[PDB]
Every structure is written in structure tokens, then in C-alpha cells.
Amino acid sequence: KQYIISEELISEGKWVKLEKTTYMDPTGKTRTWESVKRTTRKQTADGVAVIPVLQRTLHYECIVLVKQFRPPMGGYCIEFPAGLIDDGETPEAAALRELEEETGYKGDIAECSPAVCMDPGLSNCTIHIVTVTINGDDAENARPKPKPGDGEFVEVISLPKNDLLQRLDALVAEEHLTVDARVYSYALALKHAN
Amino acid sequence: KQYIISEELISEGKWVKLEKTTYMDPTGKTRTWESVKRTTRKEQTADGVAVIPVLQRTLHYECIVLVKQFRPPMGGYCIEFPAGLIDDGETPEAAALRELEEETGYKGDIAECSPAVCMDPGLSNCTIHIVTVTINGDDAENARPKPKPGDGEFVEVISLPKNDLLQRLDALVAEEHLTVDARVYSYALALKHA
Ligand SMILES: CC(C)c1ncc(Cl)c(C(N)=O)n1
Ligand SMILES: CC(C)c1ncc(Cl)c(C(N)=O)n1
Ligand SMILES: [Cl-]
Ligand SMILES: [Mg+2]
Ligand SMILES: [Mg+2]
Ligand SMILES: [Mg+2]
Ligand SMILES: [Mg+2]
């Protein structure tokens, strides 16, 4: 009942563009919406985010998260490891790669979502969420070697899965970080289960 | 270590703008980033809210109430938590309860309210509060609930059992052209993982 009629380019950056989308509203009326798009999509989705479940025997299972300065936010954020999928890269392979680069961990694919939207009111950006397990008792993950690209500066924060929401709430209160909405949603559901 | 040096307007729409962000990298070098921002953010602690609405009814399994809308940036229908911008002077809780009723017809009760969390912090500065609300589905007010969507708002309500959320979302994806929101998917995955 609703659909895209046309798109007008407003402003094209190197990495992001602003567009104005004309669409047919369900009453038969023509409307416009200002939308953002990345200039980099080819792929299934722009990117992957990894849910990295760090399993060590006789320890609480941890969720592995990353802290980085985000220029749009003007501040430090706590997030699942994530980045863009390379052209010709599968989402699974992008997930293990990004996980290793950002955290140094070598993980195993558990499951992979369909493409999901990040902020569909604002952008067309999508990701696959890839749940990965990390055998923290394997020698490859003993002294994990984080291999950032040029211009990445990433701190690793592992938090117990069974108290994740209370732990994140602590970090916000006392470290003045912003927690990512996907991380917070995951943590909430861990509490709301049953 | 890292911080914003300056922010220069690239292009400003009515609703969304693009900025060139200059910041200090952790090595002591100046770099730039193309940033997205909304034009609507005033004194709010966040742009918006998303509501996790838990529909509770005697002798029913609890449901998560979700909305389906056409999203011009996406060129399609998306399934998302009820959500909208916080009006100037409005509290996150009030905005959540109001957006829930407008989008679904349900009158909820506040359970909890997140700090401001980031939507896509590599792309934008957009933040929300994630507000968990319970809906008493035994109350007569919530018996035959009708959306009161605003001008240009067109919303379908989809209520799915919490105990099978991920499989139900997967079945909707497999039977139509549409996209699940990343927050919804993250919440459904943690329900499974718990
Ligand atoms: C709900 C807010 C964000 C809004 N209202 C109306 C329009 Cl038309 C747009 C837009 N992006 O152009 N955004
Ligand atoms: C990772 C990609 C999306 C990227 N690389 C470098 C820059 Cl500098 C920007 C930007 N938005 O300005 N984005
Ligand atoms: Cl798991
Ligand atoms: Mg990254
Ligand atoms: Mg990376
Ligand atoms: Mg809305
Ligand atoms: Mg609304």
C-alpha cells in the first residue's frame, strides 16, 4: 500500500549521504522524508555486529564488548564488536574478522540473523547480528591480540552475562559512557527472560 | 585522550543534518568524521524513546507488543518496538506511555527506564531511552485497543509471545518482505540465550 516514488540526492559525502525520499502514503497522498544512507553498501547489509559469548570453565560466561570514541556522539560508547562487511565477504566471515581485529578473540559462529535495521526512521543501515562463542580455555585466546585498522582505538570490556544489565548501568553511572541500544536491549531481555 | 575539536555544518534539512566532525585521535593527531544529527533535539536527555511493552493477561503467555510501519529510508515495512521522539519538556516515561498508546491503543504502566543509549554511534548522535512498560491486558481500557496515529502515521500492531519471540519474528520474515529492527532482534536473541 505504501512505496517509494523517487529519491533526490541532497548532499553526498565520502561515507554518508542525505536524501529526500518521495513516497505514497496509504491514503494516496504523496509525501517526503529526509533519509540518510551510507555510500559504501554493495552486500546483504552494511555491517555485522557480533554477540561474543566468552566461555571459560569455572567462570561466569561473559559478553565481550568494546569501548571506543565515537565522533558523532562526541564521547566514548560501549558496543558489540562490529564493522562493515567487505565486498565479497560473507557476514559470518566479516564477524570473525571484526571480532579478532577489535578484541583479539578467535571465535566460532553459533547463529547469524537476517539483515536487521539500525534506525529505520533515520537511515537504511542494516546489519547481521552474529552470535559467536569464544573458547576462552583454548591457547589461541589466552593472550588475545587486538589488531585494529588505521584510526581504530578500541578497549575491550568483558562483562558477566548473568548480571549484564546491572553492570552496564554501573558503567554509565560512574564512567559517563553511552551504552549502545542493541547491547542494552540484549541485557534487558536477559533480565526479562522467564 | 579523545575529544571533539569542532563541528561544521555540511548540509541541514528540516529534520536531519550532515556535519564534518573534527576530533583529536588518541595518538595526538587531528582527524575528521562525517556525522549525522537530527535537527529536533533540544534539552531532552535523548532524541526519542523506544518502548518494550509486555502485555500481561491471566491464563495467557506474556506477549511483546510490536509495530509494523512503512519506513521511507528503508523502502519497506519494518517491525519495531513502539517508538517516537520526546516532545520538548516531556519526560522519557511520559513520551513512552504516550507513544505506546498512540501507536497501539494500549495503556501501559511504567516498569523501568534506561539511561540514554545510542542508536548507531558510528553514523549518528541519535539516542533514546528504552522504557519497559507492562500492559494489564485484563483491564477494560486495554480490551479492544485502537491506535490513534498522528498525521502521516500508519501503524499495524503485532503481539508475539515472549517465550517464542525469535521463532515468531523468523516466521514473519520468511513469509513476507520486511525487516526486523536490530533492537527487537537483539532482545529476541537474549530471550533465547537466557
Ligand atoms: C518523525 C520525525 C523524525 C520526522 N517527521 C516528519 C518527517 Cl517528514 C521526517 C523526515 N525525516 O523527513 N522526520
Ligand atoms: C567505517 C566507515 C563507515 C568510516 N570510515 C572512516 C570515516 Cl572518516 C567515516 C566517516 N563516517 O566519516 N566512516
Ligand atoms: Cl548463546
Ligand atoms: Mg568497529
Ligand atoms: Mg573493526
Ligand atoms: Mg513511532
Ligand atoms: Mg508515533
GROMACS .gro file of C-alpha atoms and ligand atoms in nm:
model
  419
    1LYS     CA    1   0.000   0.000   0.000
    2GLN     CA    2   0.299   0.237   0.056
    3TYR     CA    3   0.605   0.262  -0.164
    4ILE     CA    4   0.895   0.473  -0.291
    5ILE     CA    5   0.820   0.701  -0.589
    6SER     CA    6   1.156   0.876  -0.615
    7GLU     CA    7   1.472   0.981  -0.441
    8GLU     CA    8   1.650   1.312  -0.461
    9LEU     CA    9   2.016   1.341  -0.362
   10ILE     CA   10   2.060   1.634  -0.115
   11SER     CA   11   2.424   1.602  -0.016
   12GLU     CA   12   2.689   1.331  -0.083
   13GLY     CA   13   2.987   1.284   0.146
   14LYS     CA   14   3.265   1.037   0.121
   15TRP     CA   15   3.091   0.799   0.368
   16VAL     CA   16   2.728   0.917   0.407
   17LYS     CA   17   2.464   1.092   0.201
   18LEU     CA   18   2.148   1.279   0.283
   19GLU     CA   19   1.849   1.209   0.055
   20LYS     CA   20   1.488   1.317   0.033
   21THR     CA   21   1.255   1.032  -0.047
   22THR     CA   22   0.921   1.084  -0.208
   23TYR     CA   23   0.665   0.808  -0.118
   24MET     CA   24   0.298   0.731  -0.147
   25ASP     CA   25   0.125   0.733   0.190
   26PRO     CA   26  -0.160   0.480   0.234
   27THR     CA   27  -0.433   0.745   0.171
   28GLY     CA   28  -0.297   0.803  -0.191
   29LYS     CA   29  -0.116   1.125  -0.080
   30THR     CA   30   0.245   1.197  -0.187
   31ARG     CA   31   0.491   1.275   0.100
   32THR     CA   32   0.855   1.337   0.154
   33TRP     CA   33   1.107   1.201   0.406
   34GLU     CA   34   1.466   1.306   0.473
   35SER     CA   35   1.678   0.983   0.487
   36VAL     CA   36   2.048   0.905   0.538
   37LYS     CA   37   2.237   0.628   0.354
   38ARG     CA   38   2.591   0.501   0.362
   39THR     CA   39   2.788   0.539   0.035
   40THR     CA   40   2.963   0.201   0.098
   41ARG     CA   41   2.696  -0.078   0.052
   42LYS     CA   42   2.738  -0.321  -0.250
   43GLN     CA   43   2.623  -0.698   0.028
   44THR     CA   44   2.344  -0.848   0.247
   45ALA     CA   45   2.373  -0.548   0.476
   46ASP     CA   46   2.612  -0.267   0.555
   47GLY     CA   47   2.773  -0.435   0.854
   48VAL     CA   48   2.781  -0.702   1.121
   49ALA     CA   49   2.761  -0.677   1.499
   50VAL     CA   50   2.893  -0.970   1.698
   51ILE     CA   51   2.748  -1.101   2.018
   52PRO     CA   52   3.069  -1.268   2.159
   53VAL     CA   53   2.997  -1.514   2.437
   54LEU     CA   54   3.326  -1.585   2.620
   55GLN     CA   55   3.311  -1.928   2.774
   56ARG     CA   56   3.579  -2.021   3.032
   57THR     CA   57   3.536  -2.317   3.259
   58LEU     CA   58   3.472  -2.240   3.632
   59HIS     CA   59   3.396  -1.881   3.534
   60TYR     CA   60   3.085  -1.686   3.460
   61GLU     CA   61   3.010  -1.668   3.087
   62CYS     CA   62   3.096  -1.317   2.967
   63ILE     CA   63   2.973  -1.095   2.689
   64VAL     CA   64   3.266  -0.923   2.523
   65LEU     CA   65   3.213  -0.555   2.439
   66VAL     CA   66   3.425  -0.277   2.307
   67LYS     CA   67   3.473   0.081   2.416
   68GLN     CA   68   3.574   0.346   2.157
   69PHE     CA   69   3.543   0.721   2.100
   70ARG     CA   70   3.260   0.786   1.851
   71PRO     CA   71   3.289   1.124   1.678
   72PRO     CA   72   2.916   1.161   1.605
   73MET     CA   73   2.843   1.105   1.979
   74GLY     CA   74   3.122   1.335   2.096
   75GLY     CA   75   3.206   1.070   2.355
   76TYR     CA   76   3.300   0.710   2.440
   77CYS     CA   77   3.047   0.425   2.368
   78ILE     CA   78   3.021   0.064   2.480
   79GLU     CA   79   2.914  -0.163   2.189
   80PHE     CA   80   2.919  -0.510   2.049
   81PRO     CA   81   3.218  -0.557   1.820
   82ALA     CA   82   3.115  -0.452   1.474
   83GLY     CA   83   3.224  -0.320   1.138
   84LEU     CA   84   3.137  -0.307   0.768
   85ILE     CA   85   3.120  -0.624   0.564
   86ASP     CA   86   3.398  -0.617   0.291
   87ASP     CA   87   3.275  -0.653  -0.071
   88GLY     CA   88   3.260  -1.027  -0.138
   89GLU     CA   89   3.289  -1.109   0.236
   90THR     CA   90   3.019  -1.328   0.392
   91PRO     CA   91   2.855  -1.193   0.720
   92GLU     CA   92   2.995  -1.489   0.918
   93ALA     CA   93   3.345  -1.417   0.791
   94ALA     CA   94   3.309  -1.046   0.850
   95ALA     CA   95   3.210  -1.134   1.210
   96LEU     CA   96   3.510  -1.346   1.293
   97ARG     CA   97   3.738  -1.095   1.129
   98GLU     CA   98   3.591  -0.796   1.313
   99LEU     CA   99   3.587  -0.983   1.639
  100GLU     CA  100   3.960  -1.068   1.602
  101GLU     CA  101   4.060  -0.719   1.499
  102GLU     CA  102   3.869  -0.543   1.774
  103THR     CA  103   3.921  -0.786   2.063
  104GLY     CA  104   4.193  -1.035   1.960
  105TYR     CA  105   3.947  -1.331   2.014
  106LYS     CA  106   3.904  -1.625   1.778
  107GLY     CA  107   3.553  -1.741   1.791
  108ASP     CA  108   3.312  -1.988   1.644
  109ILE     CA  109   2.988  -1.897   1.460
  110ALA     CA  110   2.674  -2.001   1.652
  111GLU     CA  111   2.398  -1.834   1.456
  112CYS     CA  112   2.354  -1.539   1.219
  113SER     CA  113   2.049  -1.313   1.188
  114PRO     CA  114   1.883  -1.192   0.872
  115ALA     CA  115   1.957  -0.833   0.781
  116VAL     CA  116   1.813  -0.611   1.057
  117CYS     CA  117   1.769  -0.231   1.055
  118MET     CA  118   1.960   0.009   1.275
  119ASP     CA  119   1.740   0.318   1.282
  120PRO     CA  120   1.481   0.283   1.006
  121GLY     CA  121   1.325   0.627   1.066
  122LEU     CA  122   1.665   0.786   1.002
  123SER     CA  123   1.862   0.558   0.770
  124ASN     CA  124   1.861   0.249   0.556
  125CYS     CA  125   2.153   0.100   0.753
  126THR     CA  126   2.132  -0.273   0.823
  127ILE     CA  127   2.347  -0.537   0.992
  128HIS     CA  128   2.359  -0.904   1.054
  129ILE     CA  129   2.382  -0.985   1.424
  130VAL     CA  130   2.617  -1.283   1.453
  131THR     CA  131   2.627  -1.476   1.777
  132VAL     CA  132   2.971  -1.623   1.828
  133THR     CA  133   3.112  -1.836   2.107
  134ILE     CA  134   3.474  -1.793   2.224
  135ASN     CA  135   3.650  -2.086   2.389
  136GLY     CA  136   3.844  -1.884   2.640
  137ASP     CA  137   4.032  -2.203   2.753
  138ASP     CA  138   4.200  -2.251   2.407
  139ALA     CA  139   4.555  -2.130   2.386
  140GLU     CA  140   4.472  -1.906   2.086
  141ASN     CA  141   4.252  -1.695   2.321
  142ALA     CA  142   4.495  -1.698   2.617
  143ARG     CA  143   4.661  -1.363   2.538
  144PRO     CA  144   4.418  -1.221   2.280
  145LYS     CA  145   4.597  -0.994   2.022
  146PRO     CA  146   4.365  -0.697   1.914
  147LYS     CA  147   4.472  -0.593   1.558
  148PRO     CA  148   4.300  -0.255   1.488
  149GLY     CA  149   4.296  -0.090   1.148
  150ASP     CA  150   4.438   0.257   1.083
  151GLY     CA  151   4.242   0.503   1.301
  152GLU     CA  152   4.078   0.247   1.534
  153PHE     CA  153   4.148   0.264   1.909
  154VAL     CA  154   3.940   0.002   2.090
  155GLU     CA  155   3.928  -0.106   2.459
  156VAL     CA  156   3.785  -0.447   2.543
  157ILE     CA  157   3.535  -0.485   2.829
  158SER     CA  158   3.406  -0.832   2.923
  159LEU     CA  159   3.106  -0.850   3.141
  160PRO     CA  160   2.927  -1.142   3.307
  161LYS     CA  161   2.628  -1.243   3.104
  162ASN     CA  162   2.410  -1.318   3.415
  163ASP     CA  163   2.446  -0.960   3.561
  164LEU     CA  164   2.499  -0.772   3.232
  165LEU     CA  165   2.227  -0.513   3.273
  166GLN     CA  166   2.340  -0.411   3.631
  167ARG     CA  167   2.698  -0.400   3.512
  168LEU     CA  168   2.621  -0.174   3.218
  169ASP     CA  169   2.410   0.055   3.439
  170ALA     CA  170   2.717   0.087   3.667
  171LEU     CA  171   2.946   0.185   3.384
  172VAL     CA  172   2.707   0.456   3.273
  173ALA     CA  173   2.660   0.600   3.626
  174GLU     CA  174   3.028   0.612   3.703
  175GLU     CA  175   3.222   0.620   3.371
  176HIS     CA  176   2.979   0.860   3.181
  177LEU     CA  177   2.988   0.621   2.877
  178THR     CA  178   2.694   0.573   2.640
  179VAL     CA  179   2.577   0.209   2.606
  180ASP     CA  180   2.459   0.101   2.260
  181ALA     CA  181   2.090   0.036   2.221
  182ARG     CA  182   2.138  -0.316   2.093
  183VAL     CA  183   2.362  -0.405   2.386
  184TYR     CA  184   2.108  -0.258   2.628
  185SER     CA  185   1.821  -0.440   2.464
  186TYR     CA  186   2.005  -0.773   2.484
  187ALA     CA  187   2.084  -0.707   2.851
  188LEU     CA  188   1.722  -0.620   2.929
  189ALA     CA  189   1.593  -0.940   2.774
  190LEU     CA  190   1.846  -1.141   2.975
  191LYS     CA  191   1.667  -0.998   3.281
  192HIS     CA  192   1.315  -1.022   3.145
  193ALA     CA  193   1.351  -1.395   3.046
  194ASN     CA  194   1.105  -1.629   3.225
  195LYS     CA  195   4.257   1.106   2.531
  196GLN     CA  196   3.986   1.174   2.259
  197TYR     CA  197   3.758   1.470   2.208
  198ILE     CA  198   3.579   1.696   1.964
  199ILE     CA  199   3.771   1.999   1.824
  200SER     CA  200   3.498   2.135   1.601
  201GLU     CA  201   3.173   2.054   1.422
  202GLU     CA  202   3.096   2.218   1.086
  203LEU     CA  203   2.760   2.209   0.914
  204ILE     CA  204   2.778   2.030   0.578
  205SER     CA  205   2.403   2.029   0.489
  206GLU     CA  206   2.090   2.095   0.702
  207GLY     CA  207   1.743   1.965   0.616
  208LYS     CA  208   1.430   2.033   0.816
  209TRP     CA  209   1.476   1.710   1.014
  210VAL     CA  210   1.828   1.571   0.958
  211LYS     CA  211   2.168   1.732   0.900
  212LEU     CA  212   2.518   1.624   0.798
  213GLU     CA  213   2.826   1.760   0.988
  214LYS     CA  214   3.205   1.738   0.940
  215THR     CA  215   3.338   1.649   1.282
  216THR     CA  216   3.695   1.729   1.367
  217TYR     CA  217   3.842   1.541   1.659
  218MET     CA  218   4.162   1.455   1.840
  219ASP     CA  219   4.274   1.092   1.792
  220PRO     CA  220   4.448   0.906   2.073
  221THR     CA  221   4.797   0.942   1.911
  222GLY     CA  222   4.756   1.326   1.924
  223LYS     CA  223   4.660   1.363   1.556
  224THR     CA  224   4.363   1.564   1.414
  225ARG     CA  225   4.111   1.352   1.211
  226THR     CA  226   3.766   1.421   1.065
  227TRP     CA  227   3.443   1.218   1.054
  228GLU     CA  228   3.118   1.273   0.869
  229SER     CA  229   2.840   1.278   1.131
  230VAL     CA  230   2.462   1.265   1.118
  231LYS     CA  231   2.241   1.454   1.359
  232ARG     CA  232   1.875   1.530   1.398
  233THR     CA  233   1.762   1.896   1.395
  234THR     CA  234   1.488   1.834   1.656
  235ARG     CA  235   1.695   1.775   1.975
  236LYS     CA  236   1.666   2.049   2.237
  237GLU     CA  237   1.711   1.995   2.618
  238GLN     CA  238   1.599   1.628   2.605
  239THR     CA  239   1.830   1.374   2.752
  240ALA     CA  240   1.771   1.185   2.425
  241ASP     CA  241   1.603   1.228   2.090
  242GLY     CA  242   1.342   0.967   2.149
  243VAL     CA  243   1.215   0.662   2.329
  244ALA     CA  244   1.150   0.300   2.234
  245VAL     CA  245   0.902   0.105   2.445
  246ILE     CA  246   0.937  -0.259   2.540
  247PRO     CA  247   0.570  -0.331   2.607
  248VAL     CA  248   0.497  -0.660   2.796
  249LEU     CA  249   0.134  -0.748   2.754
  250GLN     CA  250   0.024  -0.948   3.059
  251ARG     CA  251  -0.308  -1.135   3.086
  252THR     CA  252  -0.429  -1.405   3.317
  253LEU     CA  253  -0.403  -1.755   3.157
  254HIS     CA  254  -0.204  -1.613   2.862
  255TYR     CA  255   0.162  -1.631   2.793
  256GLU     CA  256   0.319  -1.275   2.813
  257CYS     CA  257   0.343  -1.103   2.475
  258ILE     CA  258   0.582  -0.839   2.342
  259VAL     CA  259   0.381  -0.576   2.157
  260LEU     CA  260   0.547  -0.460   1.831
  261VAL     CA  261   0.450  -0.227   1.549
  262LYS     CA  262   0.485  -0.260   1.169
  263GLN     CA  263   0.520   0.060   0.960
  264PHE     CA  264   0.644   0.173   0.623
  265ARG     CA  265   0.983   0.334   0.665
  266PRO     CA  266   1.078   0.559   0.374
  267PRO     CA  267   1.458   0.528   0.439
  268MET     CA  268   1.427   0.152   0.407
  269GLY     CA  269   1.184   0.144   0.111
  270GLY     CA  270   0.972  -0.110   0.302
  271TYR     CA  271   0.792  -0.229   0.614
  272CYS     CA  272   0.978  -0.274   0.936
  273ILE     CA  273   0.889  -0.443   1.262
  274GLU     CA  274   0.998  -0.237   1.564
  275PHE     CA  275   0.929  -0.151   1.932
  276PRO     CA  276   0.674   0.133   1.952
  277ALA     CA  277   0.887   0.449   1.946
  278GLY     CA  278   0.891   0.825   1.883
  279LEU     CA  279   1.064   1.149   1.962
  280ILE     CA  280   1.041   1.303   2.310
  281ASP     CA  281   0.840   1.631   2.289
  282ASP     CA  282   1.011   1.945   2.434
  283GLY     CA  283   0.960   1.942   2.815
  284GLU     CA  284   0.824   1.591   2.816
  285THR     CA  285   0.975   1.321   3.031
  286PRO     CA  286   1.103   0.991   2.869
  287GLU     CA  287   0.843   0.796   3.070
  288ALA     CA  288   0.558   1.025   2.957
  289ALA     CA  289   0.682   1.012   2.597
  290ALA     CA  290   0.695   0.626   2.616
  291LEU     CA  291   0.347   0.591   2.758
  292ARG     CA  292   0.210   0.842   2.509
  293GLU     CA  293   0.379   0.685   2.202
  294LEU     CA  294   0.265   0.337   2.313
  295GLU     CA  295  -0.097   0.449   2.338
  296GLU     CA  296  -0.082   0.643   2.009
  297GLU     CA  297   0.080   0.354   1.816
  298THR     CA  298  -0.103   0.055   1.973
  299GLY     CA  299  -0.404   0.171   2.173
  300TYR     CA  300  -0.263   0.017   2.492
  301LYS     CA  301  -0.232   0.198   2.823
  302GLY     CA  302   0.075   0.075   2.992
  303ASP     CA  303   0.240   0.113   3.331
  304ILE     CA  304   0.600   0.214   3.374
  305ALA     CA  305   0.839  -0.060   3.483
  306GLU     CA  306   1.183   0.080   3.412
  307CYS     CA  307   1.366   0.341   3.213
  308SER     CA  308   1.712   0.314   3.065
  309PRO     CA  309   1.971   0.588   3.052
  310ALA     CA  310   2.019   0.746   2.710
  311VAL     CA  311   2.153   0.480   2.476
  312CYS     CA  312   2.297   0.526   2.121
  313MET     CA  313   2.128   0.413   1.806
  314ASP     CA  314   2.422   0.390   1.566
  315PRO     CA  315   2.713   0.578   1.715
  316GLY     CA  316   2.949   0.537   1.416
  317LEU     CA  317   2.684   0.706   1.200
  318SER     CA  318   2.492   0.948   1.425
  319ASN     CA  319   2.446   1.112   1.760
  320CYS     CA  320   2.091   0.975   1.795
  321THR     CA  321   1.999   0.847   2.135
  322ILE     CA  322   1.690   0.707   2.305
  323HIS     CA  323   1.566   0.590   2.637
  324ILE     CA  324   1.446   0.232   2.631
  325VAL     CA  325   1.135   0.223   2.851
  326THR     CA  326   0.999  -0.108   2.973
  327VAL     CA  327   0.623  -0.085   3.035
  328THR     CA  328   0.374  -0.357   3.145
  329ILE     CA  329   0.031  -0.365   2.991
  330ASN     CA  330  -0.253  -0.504   3.206
  331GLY     CA  331  -0.445  -0.683   2.930
  332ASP     CA  332  -0.719  -0.779   3.183
  333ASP     CA  333  -0.806  -0.408   3.234
  334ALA     CA  334  -1.114  -0.295   3.035
  335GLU     CA  335  -0.913   0.005   2.900
  336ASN     CA  336  -0.691  -0.249   2.715
  337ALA     CA  337  -0.969  -0.479   2.593
  338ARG     CA  338  -1.026  -0.352   2.239
  339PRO     CA  339  -0.734  -0.100   2.194
  340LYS     CA  340  -0.736   0.129   1.881
  341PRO     CA  341  -0.420   0.309   1.756
  342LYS     CA  342  -0.460   0.695   1.746
  343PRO     CA  343  -0.178   0.755   1.499
  344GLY     CA  344  -0.086   1.120   1.418
  345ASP     CA  345  -0.080   1.291   1.075
  346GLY     CA  346   0.120   1.071   0.829
  347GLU     CA  347   0.144   0.780   1.081
  348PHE     CA  348   0.017   0.436   0.977
  349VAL     CA  349   0.082   0.155   1.219
  350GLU     CA  350  -0.008  -0.214   1.246
  351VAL     CA  351   0.017  -0.382   1.589
  352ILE     CA  352   0.179  -0.725   1.620
  353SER     CA  353   0.180  -0.903   1.955
  354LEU     CA  354   0.410  -1.208   1.984
  355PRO     CA  355   0.467  -1.447   2.276
  356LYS     CA  356   0.777  -1.364   2.469
  357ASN     CA  357   0.853  -1.736   2.512
  358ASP     CA  358   0.887  -1.785   2.127
  359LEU     CA  359   0.977  -1.438   2.010
  360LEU     CA  360   1.276  -1.516   1.787
  361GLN     CA  361   1.098  -1.800   1.605
  362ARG     CA  362   0.793  -1.589   1.552
  363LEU     CA  363   0.995  -1.300   1.409
  364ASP     CA  364   1.179  -1.555   1.186
  365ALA     CA  365   0.841  -1.685   1.064
  366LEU     CA  366   0.725  -1.331   0.978
  367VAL     CA  367   1.047  -1.260   0.789
  368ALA     CA  368   1.013  -1.593   0.600
  369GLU     CA  369   0.652  -1.518   0.489
  370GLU     CA  370   0.679  -1.152   0.373
  371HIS     CA  371   0.907  -0.872   0.252
  372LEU     CA  372   1.008  -0.685   0.565
  373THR     CA  373   1.281  -0.608   0.811
  374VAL     CA  374   1.306  -0.666   1.181
  375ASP     CA  375   1.468  -0.390   1.388
  376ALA     CA  376   1.805  -0.464   1.538
  377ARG     CA  377   1.688  -0.383   1.893
  378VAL     CA  378   1.392  -0.615   1.861
  379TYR     CA  379   1.618  -0.886   1.723
  380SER     CA  380   1.873  -0.837   1.996
  381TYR     CA  381   1.603  -0.862   2.262
  382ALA     CA  382   1.460  -1.184   2.097
  383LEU     CA  383   1.811  -1.342   2.081
  384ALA     CA  384   1.878  -1.274   2.455
  385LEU     CA  385   1.536  -1.430   2.541
  386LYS     CA  386   1.662  -1.746   2.359
  387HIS     CA  387   2.008  -1.730   2.504
  388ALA     CA  388   1.875  -1.696   2.859
  389LIG     C1  389   0.936   1.181   1.299
  389LIG     C2  390   1.037   1.291   1.264
  389LIG     C3  391   1.181   1.244   1.285
  389LIG     C4  392   1.011   1.332   1.119
  389LIG     N1  393   0.884   1.379   1.095
  389LIG     C5  394   0.849   1.407   0.967
  389LIG     C6  395   0.938   1.394   0.863
  389LIG    CL1  396   0.882   1.429   0.712
  389LIG     C7  397   1.069   1.350   0.897
  389LIG     C8  398   1.178   1.339   0.798
  389LIG     N2  399   1.281   1.260   0.833
  389LIG     O1  400   1.176   1.399   0.693
  389LIG     N3  401   1.107   1.318   1.024
  390LIG     C1  402   3.396   0.289   0.890
  390LIG     C2  403   3.345   0.388   0.783
  390LIG     C3  404   3.194   0.390   0.774
  390LIG     C4  405   3.406   0.528   0.805
  390LIG     N1  406   3.541   0.530   0.794
  390LIG     C5  407   3.605   0.646   0.806
  390LIG     C6  408   3.537   0.764   0.828
  390LIG    CL1  409   3.633   0.901   0.842
  390LIG     C7  410   3.396   0.756   0.837
  390LIG     C8  411   3.304   0.876   0.844
  390LIG     N2  412   3.171   0.848   0.865
  390LIG     O1  413   3.345   0.990   0.829
  390LIG     N3  414   3.329   0.638   0.828
  391CL      CL  415   2.439  -1.826   2.338
  392MG      MG  416   3.406  -0.138   1.459
  393MG      MG  417   3.691  -0.301   1.300
  394MG      MG  418   0.691   0.596   1.602
  395MG      MG  419   0.424   0.785   1.699
   0.00000   0.00000   0.00000
